[PDB]
């Protein structure tokens, strides 16, 4: 539901686990920012 907020990108690590990266703050996190 809804686009990611600007700056954010969804990726998958080398084991297949989905995470989210915020290119403004250079933080990566497991949690979908749209859930927050």
């Amino acid at each position: 539901l809804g686009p990611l907020p600007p700056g954010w990108e969804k990726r998958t690590d080398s084991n297949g686990r989905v995470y989210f990266v915020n290119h403004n703050t250079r933080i990566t996190q497991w949690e979908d920012p749209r859930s927050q």
Partner: peptide
């Protein structure tokens, strides 16, 4: 665990 460091990501 935590996700990769950004500087590993990019």
């Amino acid at each position: 665990e935590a996700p990769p460091c950004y500087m590993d990501v990019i």
